[PDB]
Design a protein around this ligand. Structure first.
Ligand SMILES: CC(=O)N[C@H]1[C@H]([C@H](O)[C@H](O)CO)O[C@@](O[C@H]2[C@@H](O)[C@@H](CO)O[C@@H](O[C@H]3[C@H](O)[C@@H](O)[C@H](O)O[C@@H]3CO)[C@@H]2O)(C(=O)O)C[C@@H]1O
Ligand SMILES: CC(=O)N[C@H]1[C@H]([C@H](O)[C@H](O)CO)O[C@@](O[C@H]2[C@@H](O)[C@@H](CO)O[C@@H](O[C@H]3[C@H](O)[C@@H](O)[C@H](O)O[C@@H]3CO)[C@@H]2O)(C(=O)O)C[C@@H]1O
Lengths: 367, 97, 154, 149, 110
């Protein structure tokens, strides 16, 4: 009978992969999407054989140095790159009626880098502790580290700054300041090139050595991370399934996936692993989990129907090519407009204008 | 669309040449008389899908990692609309080996 | 005492009824640090005010505590040490909806009114099940009902 | 039946660059201004050729050490210096008839130093990790650091 | 780009219409550390909800971001690196009292 009623918890409709989304949800109906990005810095996945790719998978190949000040060309696997992806979500409803639509708005997100345990393997052939008698421990990952990530309703807006604008990045297989702005680098790039701005349109492509989350005066991504320089510097990490974070903005908004896609982006350098063959100081990274919580938000449609509707129907029309009733040489000498009916003026050649607000019996031309 | 799709095949069999056994075969044509009306349905479409289309225009194409596909790195999804009293074992359904 | 930590990690399954926490502090000479104290407690209480519910009637404690290596003044054989961890769990009795369907139990005996079948795939990567739809209510007719709910299928 | 009403948010009025300010902003108007300063310590901008200026732009040139307790010469390009600037907002008051003028007041500010990633370039030419066989990593930036504003 | 940091400091006056801050992290090998964030805003508002006032419609941003020495694979030319800084200044319109009504010599040279 009245066996006491358990606590009220939110009711899960269905779980499973992305398709679960497919299902009509309703309007408060939240979605939880766990996923993750694997750390793609250097050696790609494909050389599946642990011999041919030596399975440096998730490892900077070797570290390609430089000739000297004059020549510094890295390698395309001596280069850890910005890891990312986009989740494709369902489309929600409209109301051309009240010109308002709902979008996929992320709220919070738990994330976590996993595998910090892996850096407890201390056999294997790295430089030993005691080089001398060639003994000890095969030295753990150490060195500079960097973890940064973002979550957005559009790709990550970034900015390039580099150490030496002379680095011989390859035009091929990586996006460099050049690759984006055709022309070469300048000292400016090297510090804050307001030109050297790109988008995270690719993946495992723009290296982190260049591209940075640019605090564009504008953003629908939330991101963060940090640098920790150094050579021996100890790796440190956070194992926890306890904490969530708020993509919510200052007005209680979070991102909104324009283009029903959610965008995850991040980087997780732990530091250099070091061989014995030499100081082939190549570096490691770890994967990152993601638990995005997004709801359905009703928003004022931005751009007016007509515009789109009829912007299109005007783009349908035959393209005309013809004489200039525009630009710098309009064959149009003049235009007036009237609606009212004032009584006769005096000076018929009078003018009239309206400015940042109001209308005026233009000044008697006689200034 | 606003389209009616007729589709067919009408093999009668092999026409065989008094020559050899060039069994090269024959078919006949077909007539259709469709009787069709006008029926009101509910728009299957969300018009500002185009607003979304616009966003997908202004919004670049990514390559980017697999969040769909066979090797999707989407680990899981759940949706919740209501409030059910705390379930015992939330995930205990059809047991099959 | 089997899963080497070296390999295994607390996987943030989409789903979890455990609370784990921990940290990695790397290095070769890295100095140890701890917190000798009985003062504060930690809440396993979940997002909805729940905490773990010992399914089965069990409570599962799991942990690891590497402190770093002890190096033999012999050669350079490090072989590391760890310490023990105490736990003081506070548990209450909670009411939930029933999870155990006796029909399963009793119909565990239904697949015994019939044997075990091999037979073609209708679950797997080869499910020769091309399709399932479920209908319940009633809506007026839609145009294309199999609407590409995803923007890109346009 | 009706219309759902999206959450209220501060309505944008105009955006772009400094010109925007010119709009008769009204009084409870608010202005957001994003800008940035480049770190002018050491090498000045000007010698754009990364051969003539080496393009040390954004770097102390060399390290003009001293001669002795008696002698210490700086070397002006061995000298990180205070970077600053001035945004010139528009004039707000106009009715002087009143003992009440109005002026720009700063409220908060997000700020971020960018490019920590840059310091991940470990190739190039810096003292290597292994000096000996000249191997390893062209050793990253290291040392005393200071940030203020 | 003139007063060198090595010499000049944010002198805490008696009076100040600027908020400032930063820190020194001494050392030779000392690793660098930084903060990548989009999320946090800071309040220039003062103890009385005043923050600064662009007396003379100018807003004055100032900063310094030394990261440490880049050491040339050569000798020990320790020349040191710096980085740039973003600013999002949030500012409103505040009301005040006309100062000029303090007559001729009553304020002139006072
Ligand atoms: C087991 C082992 O010694 N692994 C090394 C490898 C191997 O030496 C080899 O490259 C793969 O079997 O080298 C690693 O670093 C390499 C990396 O920097 C790549 C970048 O392209 O270059 C390798 O040497 C190059 C050389 O720089 C090129 O000019 C030349 O065209 O090809 C050479 C390789 O054939 C570096 O050795 C690596 O992971 O591949 C580091 C491992 O420790
Ligand atoms: C790749 C490299 O090692 N670059 C060096 C440079 C080069 O040696 C230089 O660019 C060659 O033209 O030297 C750097 O150190 C210089 C720096 O300490 C400045 C400080 O003023 O002095 C230079 O020597 C001066 C000398 O002190 C002056 O009295 C004289 O008038 O001019 C000399 C230079 O021609 C140091 O060489 C440099 O930044 O230029 C350090 C770089 O790492």
């Amino acid at each position: 009978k009245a066996c006491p009623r358990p606590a009220p918890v939110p009711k899960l409709l269905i779980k499973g992969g992305m398709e679960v989304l497919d299902l009509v949800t309703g309007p408060d109906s939240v979605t939880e999407i766990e996923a993750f990005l694997n750390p793609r810095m250097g050696q790609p996945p494909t050389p599946e054989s642990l011999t041919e790719g030596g399975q440096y998978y998730g490892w900077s190949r070797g570290i390609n140095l430089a000739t000297s000040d004059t020549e510094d060309s890295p390698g395309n696997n001596t280069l850890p790159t910005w890891s990312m992806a986009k989740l494709q979500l369902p489309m929600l409803n409209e109301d051309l009626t009240c010109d308002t639509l709902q979008m996929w708005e992320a709220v919070s997100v738990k994330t976590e880098v996993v595998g910090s345990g892996s850096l407890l393997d201390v056999h294997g052939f790295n430089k030993p502790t005691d080089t001398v008698n060639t003994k000890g421990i095969s030295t753990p990952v150490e060195g500079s580290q960097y973890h940064v990530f973002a979550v957005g309703g559009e790709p990550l807006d970034l900015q390039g700054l580099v150490t030496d604008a002379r680095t011989k990045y390859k035009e091929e297989g990586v996006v460099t300041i050049k690759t984006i702005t055709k022309k070469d680098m300048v000292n400016k790039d090297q510090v804050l090139n307001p030109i050297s701005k790109a988008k995270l349109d690719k993946d495992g492509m723009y290296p982190v050595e260049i591209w940075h989350p640019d605090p564009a005066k504008n953003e629908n991504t939330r991101y963060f991370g940090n640098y920790t320089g150094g050579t021996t510097t100890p790796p440190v990490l956070q194992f926890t399934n306890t904490l969530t974070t708020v993509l919510l903005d200052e007005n209680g908004v979070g991102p909104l996936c324009k283009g029903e896609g959610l965008y995850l982006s991040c980087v997780d350098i732990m530091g250099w692993r070091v061989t014995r063959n030499y100081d082939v100081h190549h570096w490691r990274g770890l994967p990152r989990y993601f638990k995005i919580t997004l709801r359905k938000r009703w928003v004022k449609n931005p751009y007016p129907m007509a515009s789109l509707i009829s912007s299109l129907f005007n783009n349908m029309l035959p393209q005309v090519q013809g004489q200039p009733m525009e630009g710098e040489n309009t064959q149009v000498e003049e235009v007036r407009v009237y609606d009212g009916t004032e009584p006769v003026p005096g000076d018929p050649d009078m003018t009239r204008y309206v400015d940042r607000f109001g209308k005026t019996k233009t000044v008697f031309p006689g200034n």
